Amino acid sequence: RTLPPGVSDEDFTSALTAFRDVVGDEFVRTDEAELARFHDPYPVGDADAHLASAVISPRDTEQVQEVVRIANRYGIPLSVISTGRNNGYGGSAPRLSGAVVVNTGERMNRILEVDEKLGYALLEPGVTYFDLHEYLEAHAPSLMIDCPDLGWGSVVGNALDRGAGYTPYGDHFMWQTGMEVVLPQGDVMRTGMGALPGSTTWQLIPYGFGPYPDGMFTQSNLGIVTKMGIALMQKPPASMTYQITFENESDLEQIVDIMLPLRINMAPLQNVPVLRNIILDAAVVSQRADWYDGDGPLPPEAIERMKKELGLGYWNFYGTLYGPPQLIEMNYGIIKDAFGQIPGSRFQTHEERHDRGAHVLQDRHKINNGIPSLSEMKLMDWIPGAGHVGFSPISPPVGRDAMKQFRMVRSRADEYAKDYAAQFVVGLREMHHIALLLFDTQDATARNETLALTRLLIDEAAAEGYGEYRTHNALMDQVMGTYNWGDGALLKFHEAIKDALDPNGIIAPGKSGVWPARYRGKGL
Amino acid sequence: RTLPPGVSDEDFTSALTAFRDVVGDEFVRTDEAELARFHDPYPVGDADAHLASAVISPRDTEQVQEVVRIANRYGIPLSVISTGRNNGYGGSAPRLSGAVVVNTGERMNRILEVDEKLGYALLEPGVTYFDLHEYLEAHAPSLMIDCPDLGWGSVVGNALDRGAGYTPYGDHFMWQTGMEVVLPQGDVMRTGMGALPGSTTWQLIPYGFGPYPDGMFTQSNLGIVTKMGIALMQKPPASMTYQITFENESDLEQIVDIMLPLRINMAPLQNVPVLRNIILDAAVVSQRADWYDGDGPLPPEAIERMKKELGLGYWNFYGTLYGPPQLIEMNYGIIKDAFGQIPGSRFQTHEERHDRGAHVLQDRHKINNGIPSLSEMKLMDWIPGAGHVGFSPISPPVGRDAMKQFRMVRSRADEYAKDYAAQFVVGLREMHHIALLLFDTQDATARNETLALTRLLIDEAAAEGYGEYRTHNALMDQVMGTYNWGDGALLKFHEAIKDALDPNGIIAPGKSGVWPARYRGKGL
Numbered sequence A, B: 001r002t003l004p005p006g007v008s009d010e011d012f013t014s015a016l017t018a019f020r021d022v023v024g025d026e027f028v029r030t031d032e033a034e035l036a037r038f039h040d041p042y043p044v045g046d047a048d049a050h051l052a053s054a055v056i057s058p059r060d061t062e063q064v065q066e067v068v069r070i071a072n073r074y075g076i077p078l079s080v081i082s083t084g085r086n087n088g089y090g091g092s093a094p095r096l097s098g099a100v101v102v103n104t105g106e107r108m109n110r111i112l113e114v115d116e117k118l119g120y121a122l123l124e125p126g127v128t129y130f131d132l133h134e135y136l137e138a139h140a141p142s143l144m145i146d147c148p149d150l151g152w153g154s155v156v157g158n159a160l161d162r163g164a165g166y167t168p169y170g171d172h173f174m175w176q177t178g179m180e181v182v183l184p185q186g187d188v189m190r191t192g193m194g195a196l197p198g199s200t201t202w203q204l205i206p207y208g209f210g211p212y213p214d215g216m217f218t219q220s221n222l223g224i225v226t227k228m229g230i231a232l233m234q235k236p237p238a239s240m241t242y243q244i245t246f247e248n249e250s251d252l253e254q255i256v257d258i259m260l261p262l263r264i265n266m267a268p269l270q271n272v273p274v275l276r277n278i279i280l281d282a283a284v285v286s287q288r289a290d291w292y293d294g295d296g297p298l299p300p301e302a303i304e305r306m307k308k309e310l311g312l313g314y315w316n317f318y319g320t321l322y323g324p325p326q327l328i329e330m331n332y333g334i335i336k337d338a339f340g341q342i343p344g345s346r347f348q349t350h351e352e353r354h355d356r357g358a359h360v361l362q363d364r365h366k367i368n369n370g371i372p373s374l375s376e377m378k379l380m381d382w383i384p385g386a387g388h389v390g391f392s393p394i395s396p397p398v399g400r401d402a403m404k405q406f407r408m409v410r411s412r413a414d415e416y417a418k419d420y421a422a423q424f425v426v427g428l429r430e431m432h433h434i435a436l437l438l439f440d441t442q443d444a445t446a447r448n449e450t451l452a453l454t455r456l457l458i459d460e461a462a463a464e465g466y467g468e469y470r471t472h473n474a475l476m477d478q479v480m481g482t483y484n485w486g487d488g489a490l491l492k493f494h495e496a497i498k499d500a501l502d503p504n505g506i507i508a509p510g511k512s513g514v515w516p517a518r519y520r521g522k523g524l
């Protein structure tokens, strides 16, 4: 029977009773079959790391406060999910193995308010991108969401891990406006203009008066968020999505150097541009076995067969244009002129291309217009038992940096028997190298190889000045360990704040490598 | 001889010696004549409130750390300035009367780095908007700053109070990217991607890994900032600034309701739109005595005389358009069509109007193109000894709310013998009512009346759900007191963090109403 670390069988029995006394017997789950549902689907080390001792589903803010107070009484560590679909980063699994999962999304799943004219929503954690899309289409159709690739995630949960989408509102944390948060001893606070009783402005300016705190609750164990506002973009009058195929792996350098000047002013590259390699485009519409059934990495002739059969390049650029048709034509003209300088570049619109090779184009056209999709889950059929772990370091949006990272990561992936499926994404002034490290989750050796590969990728990236933005439970200590300027000054600051707010060391211990005192330096 | 609160003459002597040993004799100032220079120029209520006991000018980060350690040893409270031009909010005056001022800007005044292609600067606190503008014009001329009305302020200091300008980069804190900060016991830390030694990305993404903390150092006493990055916008190929005059004070409702839909998508209102009343337009180019020399409020016929003589409306709208001249013409066309629905509206371009009444138009044309100015200081010649206090609550960008505020504020201003000079500003989805309450700083009665008026304005605004964004030393306790959702949960959070980071209660005690334990509840 899984016990939280540092809690006696007796204290755990007492805590479960107290939790049931608040949320109801139905909403305290301890059966192995119910706990198995919160397993990381894509485990990277031992599959048995990151287990839940229980899952608690509080009805509302008041119940969150009371479960937090009970946790403080009995020293119960509590991890937190909204929808818990953080796949690539641990799913719903706690960093601290044996923690009790607070499932905020199961019961706190209401769209509390949508203002169509001022363009915002006030939301609870259980609202999925599908849920909010459905609500806006029925009740506020001039607005659109900004969604990640998969719509089953939480508008709140994704933003609290600083996740991202691909519309002009792609930076989810940027558009987060106002929070209600239960602090680690059970006090509730509203941020920003929400701290002013009766304010009408909670969702229209992020800051409020005095220190601005909301960011301290993102990639954070300082609070359980119960309500979160987000700004919503107005649907433009029209949109068009285009694909640019580039023949040569060496085109990456010139693509990035043309991309930056066209994105940095948010026009003509109006949405978040993505540059996907042949493998993460081919893997949506085909299986690895379709191209190659030998052992070792995919040979060049397998890559060439994918390009030819599917009509794709080694690098595949996807962008969306918004506005009246005259603006779209004009901006597309500038884009075609700029990227057309690259020999072998080919341009297709979402209304021009409708074949197997256009599947990603049509999906990006949904995503880039705030229409949520689960099409990208087909990537997980590339190989049997496929799982991914996220690797997404930040670099300057400079072709030379792109080429260095492309070569560094692919050569290590080849060495560790993992296919090189990756994209380069430029937000505004920053570049992300998002590598989908696909592995057989059912194979202990493949899980070990993926963990070893990722630790090596993080260290080599950090040595080049490229820090990881978001990581898996298994990598959080290592990634925080790379941000050790001033003899670990950033982590010492985080620890000082964690220990002051959370003296009993209750909320999601080890999230982002930040351990409260009672669990720190204990090797977990 | 001014002593800090809670420090013996002996401990103060010891501290000043240790400070001289670090920064140099010349950079520890205690002469009454040098201290008088750090007096609030626009004191509200008692002029003698908010005195400095000394001013310390550290050469660099290392000296800031050592002066902070000395302060911790001797319990010396230390306030902070960059350029100390926070006029309307206390100037360089400490919230805690008798604090020692850390003058970061005097010697830490270097532009450390400007990247033209990636559009950012890394700066020290002493860099003024004039300094940065001059540097860009000489060494990176494709970039422009975003400046407030007066260029003598600090790019860093203004951002740390969440100040604002009027280009698309008007939200200074939003474009702040990376900080170096000395924490209250003397530890130094870098935020974001700067926490990774050798990172190449400090100024190109704000967040980093783990809880995002930079907002906690704005309107804050949690540390002394020694370096700050800021993103810099590319100069567009062309710009035009326009003035719309509106005849009727009652036009405000329709102006705000037309403004919001044209701004919320950042086009066609591409810059920060400002709507200035006759008095803050007239006060730049004339004196109150020019229009009226009787006692009591300005009569309506005095307002009408200002309008006609200067060719101004009751409400004067200023906006800027950017892009190729065809985009400017097109956007200006949409703006003229929309606001032209208001009878009596008149449109003038920065190339069409060059008379006394076009002074503000030509100044906005500079400011809205990141050309810093001191023209708005002419406002302080309105009446003899003029000073102002800032009142700037946030509201929904809705005409009804604007009208309510206009009337509430003007009515009270009349009662308290102060002219209503104000503007309405829409950032994106929020509105600011920025009232410049002008008063005779040399007149004890006028200072007392201004403080009484502002306390009343804050309470009445708060009762309507309109919170203050930024305030004077004298008002910080009251303003924080209005953000008291959940029995003051926000301030209790800020106090918990202050006491953890600052156990000896050293940095800018009482900033934003946040007092460390040793000074809290002592009425100062």
Ligand SMILES: Cc1cc2nc3c(=O)[nH]c(=O)nc-3n(C[C@H](O)[C@H](O)[C@H](O)COP(=O)(O)OP(=O)(O)OC[C@H]3O[C@@H](n4cnc5c(N)ncnc54)[C@H](O)[C@@H]3O)c2cc1C
Binding pocket: A080, A081, A082, A083, A084, A085, A086, A087, A088, A091, A092, A104, A125, A147, A148, A149, A150, A152, A153, A154, A155, A156, A157, A158, A160, A161, A162, A163, A164, A165, A219, A220, A223, A224, A225, A226, A376, A377, A379, A388, A511
């Ligand atoms: C093929 C594939 C594609 C992906 N594409 C993208 C993509 O385009 N963009 C993207 O951003 N991600 C992407 N992901 C990663 C991940 O799937 C999504 O980010 C997903 O939306 C996150 O899970 P969630 O929304 O259910 O959040 P959750 O799992 O509910 O929460 C995420 C984290 O936030 C914190 N948390 C959640 N709720 C609270 C709360 N109430 N209070 C305090 N803390 C809380 C916890 O740390 C938690 O682990 C992708 C993954 C895969 C496998």
Ligand SMILES: Cc1cc2nc3c(=O)[nH]c(=O)nc-3n(C[C@H](O)[C@H](O)[C@H](O)COP(=O)(O)OP(=O)(O)OC[C@H]3O[C@@H](n4cnc5c(N)ncnc54)[C@H](O)[C@@H]3O)c2cc1C
Binding pocket: B080, B081, B082, B083, B084, B085, B086, B087, B088, B091, B092, B104, B125, B147, B148, B149, B150, B152, B153, B154, B155, B156, B157, B158, B160, B161, B162, B163, B164, B165, B219, B220, B223, B224, B225, B226, B376, B377, B379, B388, B508, B511
């Ligand atoms: C007529 C008039 C017009 C104005 N127009 C505008 C305007 O358009 N926009 C606007 O924003 N303001 C405006 N102001 C207010 C004010 O003049 C400006 O904001 C000014 O730029 C602020 O002073 P500063 O830049 O010198 O900053 P400082 O006074 O140096 O710093 C401001 C505050 O930041 C903190 N701080 C400073 N340095 C540090 C540091 N190194 N570490 C930690 N904390 C620090 C302190 O709390 C300090 O009080 C106006 C004022 C007047 C009188």
Ligand SMILES: COc1cc(C=O)ccc1O
Binding pocket: A087, A088, A089, A149, A389, A390, A391, A392, A434, A436, A470
């Ligand atoms: C697992 O992390 C991510 C995955 C993707 C798509 O593969 C995009 C952004 C991410 O953060």
Ligand SMILES: COc1cc(C=O)ccc1O
Binding pocket: B087, B088, B149, B389, B390, B391, B392, B434, B436, B470
């Ligand atoms: C006095 O403070 C301010 C003044 C102005 C312009 O008068 C704009 C924003 C401010 O915060």
